[PDB]
Amino acid sequence: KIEEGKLVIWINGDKGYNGLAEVGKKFEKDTGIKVTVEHPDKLEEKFPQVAATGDGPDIIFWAHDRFGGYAQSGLLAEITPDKAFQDKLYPFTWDAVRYNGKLIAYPIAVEALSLIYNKDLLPNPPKTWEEIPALDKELKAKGKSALMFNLQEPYFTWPLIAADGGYAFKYENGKYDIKDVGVDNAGAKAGLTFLVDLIKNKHMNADTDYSIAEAAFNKGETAMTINGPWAWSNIDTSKVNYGVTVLPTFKGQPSKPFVGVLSAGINAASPNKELAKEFLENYLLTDEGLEAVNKDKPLGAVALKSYEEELAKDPRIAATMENAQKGEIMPNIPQMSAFWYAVRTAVINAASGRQTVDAALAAAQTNAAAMATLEKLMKAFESLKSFQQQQQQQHQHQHQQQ
Amino acid sequence: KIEEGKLVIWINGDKGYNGLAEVGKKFEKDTGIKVTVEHPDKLEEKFPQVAATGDGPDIIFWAHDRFGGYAQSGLLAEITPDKAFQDKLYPFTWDAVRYNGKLIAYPIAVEALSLIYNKDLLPNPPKTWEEIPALDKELKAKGKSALMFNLQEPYFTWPLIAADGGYAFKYENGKYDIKDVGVDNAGAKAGLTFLVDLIKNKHMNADTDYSIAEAAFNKGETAMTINGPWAWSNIDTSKVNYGVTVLPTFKGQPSKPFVGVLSAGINAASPNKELAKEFLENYLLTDEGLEAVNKDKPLGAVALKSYEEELAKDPRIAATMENAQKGEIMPNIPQMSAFWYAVRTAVINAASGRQTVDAALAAAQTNAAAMATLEKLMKAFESLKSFQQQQQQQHQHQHQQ
Amino acid sequence: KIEEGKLVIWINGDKGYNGLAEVGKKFEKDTGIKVTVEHPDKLEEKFPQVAATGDGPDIIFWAHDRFGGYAQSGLLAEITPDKAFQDKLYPFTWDAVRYNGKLIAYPIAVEALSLIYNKDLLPNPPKTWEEIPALDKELKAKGKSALMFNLQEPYFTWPLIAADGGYAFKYENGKYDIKDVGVDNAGAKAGLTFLVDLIKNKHMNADTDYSIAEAAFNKGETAMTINGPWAWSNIDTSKVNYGVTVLPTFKGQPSKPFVGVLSAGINAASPNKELAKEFLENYLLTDEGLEAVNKDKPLGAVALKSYEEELAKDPRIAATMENAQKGEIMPNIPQMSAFWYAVRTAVINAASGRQTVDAALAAAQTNAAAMATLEKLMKAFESLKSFQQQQQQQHQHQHQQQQQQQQQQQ
Ligand SMILES: [Zn+2]
Ligand SMILES: [Zn+2]
Ligand SMILES: [Zn+2]
Ligand SMILES: [Zn+2]
Ligand SMILES: [Zn+2]
Ligand SMILES: [Zn+2]
Ligand SMILES: [Zn+2]
Ligand SMILES: [Zn+2]
Ligand SMILES: [Zn+2]
Ligand SMILES: [Zn+2]
Ligand SMILES: [Zn+2]
Ligand SMILES: [Zn+2]
Ligand SMILES: [Zn+2]
Ligand SMILES: [Zn+2]
Ligand SMILES: [Zn+2]
Ligand SMILES: [Zn+2]
Ligand SMILES: [Zn+2]
Ligand SMILES: [Zn+2]
Ligand SMILES: [Zn+2]
Ligand SMILES: [Zn+2]
Ligand SMILES: [Zn+2]
Ligand SMILES: [Zn+2]
Ligand SMILES: [Zn+2]
Ligand SMILES: [Zn+2]
Ligand SMILES: [Zn+2]
Ligand SMILES: [Zn+2]
Ligand SMILES: [Zn+2]
Ligand SMILES: [Zn+2]
Ligand SMILES: [Zn+2]
Ligand SMILES: [Zn+2]
Ligand SMILES: [Zn+2]
Known part of the structure; x- marks a missing residue:
């Protein structure tokens, strides 16, 4: 009805x-x-x-x-x-x-995500990822930093990872091929290696979450941040003079948010x-x-x-x-759950230095398949609950038969 | 030997x-x-x-x-x-x-399944499924019903479901393709929609089982039923003048039992x-x-x-x-086990109105994979037990190492 | 570093x-x-x-x-x-x-495995498997056996099984196809049949393992054994005059170790x-x-x-x-764990008489899939544990960066 x-x-x-x-x-x-x-x-x-x-x-x-x-x-x-x-x-x-x-x-x-820069600190935002490390040294002299964004969620770090040929699943023929994952290819390797190199050279902090990233930009501590349109309202209230622009390129390729x-x-x-x-x-x-x-x-x-x-x-x-x-x-596929689980872990373990970029991304393939199994079990047992409840109702009852 | x-x-x-x-x-x-x-x-x-x-x-x-x-x-x-x-x-x-x-x-x-009709009540059985809703009203004026068959098992309802293009697995070149399942296509969908439309229009009851359908035909309460050769001897004893004919055609196409x-x-x-x-x-x-x-x-x-x-x-x-x-x-493939489990629930949920035909048949894929996993879990542990004895019992223990 | x-x-x-x-x-x-x-x-x-x-x-x-x-x-x-x-x-x-x-x-x-023969007992080693049952009856008259090797491990029995067309997985285009398993094809069947035929004709014993096989050849009770280079040193010590040669051919096809x-x-x-x-x-x-x-x-x-x-x-x-x-x-693939598990059982069951060659090798396909299930099952929970405890790793690190992130500057 x-x-x-x-x-x-x-x-x-x-x-x-x-x-x-x-x-x-x-x-x-x-x-x-x-x-x-x-x-x-x-x-x-x-x-x-x-x-x-x-x-x-x-x-x-x-x-x-x-x-x-x-x-x-x-x-x-x-x-x-x-x-x-x-x-x-x-x-x-x-x-x-x-x-x-x-x-x-x-x-x-x-x-989609964009690059948000402080106009007062930085009038000409960088067009490339490669010039940011040099730009951080110039700002650290003034007691500021070049870039602070959330590193905990893969959603925020993905734009850089996918820049050079990284993908979630290959989209061809109007269908996502779940056998074709682009997480440990050559371009995703370079993307993450750049992110980890940014961290071990102290240009970024591995523990930077959403709160820490937002609060920093809105106080005028950091020159740049990576965020979506949902954050603009809070930046408006801080009175910070900001601009929203195209994301930096990596190896000449655009960031893919x-x-x-x-x-x-x-x-x-x-x-x-x-x-x-x-x-x-x-x-x-x-x-x-x-x-x-x-x-x-x-x-x-x-x-x-x-x-x-x-x-x-x-x-x-x-x-x-x-x-x-x-x-x-x-x-929009169900396999997207296992992808987040694996990549969230992959980036955390590379950023902390717990695993090499090469080994952390290789682990994603086996970690996602492992998560698919938990989901595969999850669906199987909830199906059994339903099945027993199905029969339990009609077929043999406190007041029925078969 | x-x-x-x-x-x-x-x-x-x-x-x-x-x-x-x-x-x-x-x-x-x-x-x-x-x-x-x-x-x-x-x-x-x-x-x-x-x-x-x-x-x-x-x-x-x-x-x-x-x-x-x-x-x-x-x-x-x-x-x-x-x-x-x-x-x-x-x-x-x-x-x-x-x-x-x-x-x-x-x-x-x-x-195979066939349409069994009561000759005394209905001398000319319908050739199409489409005319059964109209034929029921004509019989309800005499206190009788047009058709009653087992709706609990999919084996009986599948003939209609498969009529317009539904199928279990694709059969070409002498082998089944277990990745080509046709329980969610437009043909299976329209077939099941007609079965549900019959129940929501009071022509059939959603909880009619094998016992209820057989007893109703053998007493002369319904004009038609769908059943196999196994049931003929029971109708013979009931003294009912009955015939066995081709299953009704849906959308101009034959039922596929x-x-x-x-x-x-x-x-x-x-x-x-x-x-x-x-x-x-x-x-x-x-x-x-x-x-x-x-x-x-x-x-x-x-x-x-x-x-x-x-x-x-x-x-x-x-x-x-x-x-x-x-x-x-x-x-004759082992994937049929899981197929039945999914379709049985699909039809029941569509007939009772817990799921829309579209949603009921969509869940079939996810329930077939569920029974697969469940069924593969039990092959896993059965094996683990066998090994366990073999190594456990034959390979070594007191009197050996 | x-x-x-x-x-x-x-x-x-x-x-x-x-x-x-x-x-x-x-x-x-x-x-x-x-x-x-x-x-x-x-x-x-x-x-x-x-x-x-x-x-x-x-x-x-x-x-x-x-x-x-x-x-x-x-x-x-x-x-x-x-x-x-x-x-x-x-x-x-x-x-x-x-x-x-x-x-x-x-x-x-x-x-790789090779045929090891006793020279003093057998100067001319058999080029074919088919002549081994006839060669055993000659040696039983002198209180000896023709051949004794480890039958508990599939590694040792596989050479014979693979000979006529049995394979773990097909290796083509430099890739291993895990969907194409040749354990219950006509060739592997025929191999295991000969092995089982040797046992029930009392030419070999179903209970023969690595230790029984080695000790019997080293004392000079059996004419031949199948083993690798790792065992040469032990045979050297036993003062047995032995040779290492090519494995016997089955149906004209070479043994595939x-x-x-x-x-x-x-x-x-x-x-x-x-x-x-x-x-x-x-x-x-x-x-x-x-x-x-x-x-x-x-x-x-x-x-x-x-x-x-x-x-x-x-x-x-x-x-x-x-x-x-x-x-x-x-x-060099992970699917090999499940293969050994399944083939080990297949041979053990066929040798004992518990199952026929056909039934044994057919049940290897389901036994390999069952082991594959167990493995991804134990991989999924290792994954959950690692993640589960990672939730803590963050909690602790929320109270670390908060300070240090201020100590340096603040
Ligand atoms: Zn630097
Ligand atoms: Zn509201
Ligand atoms: Zn909401
Ligand atoms: Zn409101
Ligand atoms: Zn305009
Ligand atoms: Zn008998
Ligand atoms: Zn009507
Ligand atoms: Zn049509
Ligand atoms: Zn054909
Ligand atoms: Zn055809
Ligand atoms: Zn003839
Ligand atoms: Zn098809
Ligand atoms: Zn005749
Ligand atoms: Zn005759
Ligand atoms: Zn006759
Ligand atoms: Zn046909
Ligand atoms: Zn059947
Ligand atoms: Zn290190
Ligand atoms: Zn030199
Ligand atoms: Zn030199
Ligand atoms: Zn013989
Ligand atoms: Zn080659
Ligand atoms: Zn043939
Ligand atoms: Zn032993
Ligand atoms: Zn030399
Ligand atoms: Zn030199
Ligand atoms: Zn050492
Ligand atoms: Zn070769
Ligand atoms: Zn090895
Ligand atoms: Zn907390
Ligand atoms: Zn920390």
Whole structure:
């Protein structure tokens, strides 16, 4: 039961839902069909539960990486935009909303890491990673540092690692090959070796986490930091004069940060598929549609070419998109769990000097496969719980038989 | 040993063993070689144990789906019938007795699901699934229901599911591809959606089992049911005027029921491999041979073209074969274990409404891998135990080092 | 830290380390670079532990089968010999030091099983397996047996099993295909059948192990035994007049023993990679180089063609190489643990009569998969433990960097 004759939308609380409701208000005045916008707690946890039974919203807004799991479960419907509508959004975004060859969601916003520099300390940010060590010595004389960013999470260190030919899984033929991992290749080796060399030459500290990195830049202690659009608001409050720009190149190659895409998916159980399509394609994914949402709570860089060109007058939003286009799209597959587990360990152990770069990255392959087994066990036993509960109910009972 | 100079045959207690003994008695009169026919308890469980050590029968008669496990273990011999003898049996039946490319048994009988209708209530049975919802309303005016069949086991519901393009595993070039599963495709999806649509529209009950469906047809409460030849004798006692016909077509395409094939395999440890070929090919697999078995206990439809055409004068035996030819053969691979587990839950959850058809069939892949892991865990520890004794017991201990 | 400017070598205690040190001394006299040769206890277990952290020796010497694991962990560097140097060694040996398509070590010495016969009892050794049952009946009349070897280990029985077309894994394009297992094909079946046929015809005993086999040949109770070079010293002491020859052919096909290659690998963490290449290629892998090592403790057959020709004037060393050249190199992959586990059981069960050849060899496929399961099972929990305790490592390090990060500046 989702109610035929109306649309119900689920979007997270930190987004411009009131602005989205104004698009749904515009939709009513034209079609006479009422659009409700709901923003429930942990909707990402709730959606798989309710949609499995045939309930939940008509449309759901979330990051694309979580949509891979929804489509695996058959909770999302295959969308049908034509060639001409597909030309409206940046071609690279459409690859993020693909599962099993077929398209499963509409890309809305684009999210990726950028290089954030202090304008007062550093008017000309470096274009290369290689010139940062020399730039640190020049700033250490003034009692400052060149660069401080989170080293604990692989998400932040990956841009450098992937610069030279490092990848999570090979994306070819619209499918991720899980037998083709680019974690201990030549380019990932050099990327991490540069990061470790930065640490043992005291240009960075191996223990630097998110808090330590943010607090440093916002006090004016460090000239540069690596962070996403979610951090801009806190830098605005610190009164620091900052700029957001393209990430530094390593061995002439651009940094490849992970790209997160906010996407709109249609519930497979929805009896209003065509209505949702009309809403999303012809009301929301238009200049006026995205503007209403952006004015409530900024979307950052958007998928729609026409509206992105208008936001890109903000040099920070242009930088987000530029880094995104040069970046790697976040894979939406289940194997991504084992990847994080292994690479998080790999970088920690190389940065501490516990393992060589060569041996820490080699260990990732065997460490991720090990984690896949725990997940493989996890699913097997929860299946048995269900099986026993299944029979326990019908077949032999305190008041039944077979 | 299995004794050279004679044949010993294993065949289940519910088959025409006396009739087979007669065929052995004909064999003894022509060749001077004594044939013994035995029927031990749980011979399907006993065969893998004794054949592994080199003992057991020369020939074993059983459903082909169990012969995969025997051939995998190397307990069966590669049979050598020539082209001329292979034209004597229906072409599709040979696919049932093929493991790893090699042929490993002789096809004897053919079992499959068929549509059984009540002639007095419904003289003209529906040819399409699509017209059953309309046919139910017409019968509900007389307090009766159109169709009731077992919905708990997938074996019964699969015919519909596979109708439009669903399949267990892909079968090309004589071998299954365990990576080409067709339980999540558009055809299997539409098939199961029709089954669920029937239940949500009150034409069928989601909790109808084998007992409930059989009893309803034999009392005359329902007009149609889906079942195999095994159930005919119970309908015969109920005095119900019944017929057996082709399964209804869904989306203009036939239902594809799974096909069981009673097969005769030769033991790998048998010193009488040549005598078994002579007996199975030139004595049993003839009109006269199968006649003798069929008169003791009916074989149903048979693999041999000549004797089948003779049996097809019984319209029930013609329909069993017709449904079998349109259907697919029950895969004899070990991945079938996990396949059943996943599809049984898929259908139950779709029928009860715990999962949408799409979501129910999607979870099938993840449940098949679950049963695989679970099933592979138990092969791991079984092995560890065996080793443990072997090293533990044979290799050294008090009285040794 | 491994020290740049000098070479440190790890070689097992039962090898000619003094002879190697003399090659190190020769290197020092020409180049002025000192070479230390260390022989630590259980170095094969220690090397992965220390080379992971960036320590350990510059060069390591060990059987090639263990090097695959070192390469998998990225502890070994890619060696760079040119075409002209690769012609110096036997082409087959280079396949033993290969992993992921890269070369990872220099082949030094070759080790393989051979047929060892008693000369006084049997001057003309049988060229075929098929004539051994007939030759046993002749010797039983004189109160002796024809052949006695270890039947408990698959390493010893495999030569016969592999002969007609049995293989652990298919080696093509320089890669090991783990999906193509030839343990229950027609050839391996026929081999094991002959072995089992020998036992139930009382020509061999199913309970015969390494100790029973060796002691029986050394006292002069059996005419032939199958064993490696490692056992020659014991037979020398027993005053038995013995020869080492090519293994008997089964169905006209040669017996295929597994080949062990003693190899020199360069540490990936070594700051002397170019120095180690100079040493190994131009000082050790020369007639004079291997001469010095061989005179300390014999190497057996060697990888270097030139020095092999000189050693082949020993009829025992020539036979070791002959058997090694007809046999297959032991796969350097992890899947080999499960293979030994399964084949060991297969043969034990077939020999005892517990299972038929067919049933035994078919059950090897499931027994190998079961062992593979156990291994990744114990690897997954080692992974969980390591991570689980890593959560603490962070907690403690949150109270360390917090201060120091302020001490220096603050
Ligand atoms: Zn709020
Ligand atoms: Zn809320
Ligand atoms: Zn939330
Ligand atoms: Zn520096
Ligand atoms: Zn404009
Ligand atoms: Zn008997
Ligand atoms: Zn079956
Ligand atoms: Zn013929
Ligand atoms: Zn053949
Ligand atoms: Zn209806
Ligand atoms: Zn169609
Ligand atoms: Zn075909
Ligand atoms: Zn075909
Ligand atoms: Zn296919
Ligand atoms: Zn006839
Ligand atoms: Zn006759
Ligand atoms: Zn007749
Ligand atoms: Zn067909
Ligand atoms: Zn160190
Ligand atoms: Zn000199
Ligand atoms: Zn010199
Ligand atoms: Zn020592
Ligand atoms: Zn070895
Ligand atoms: Zn080659
Ligand atoms: Zn004999
Ligand atoms: Zn012993
Ligand atoms: Zn020299
Ligand atoms: Zn010389
Ligand atoms: Zn060869
Ligand atoms: Zn804490
Ligand atoms: Zn610390």
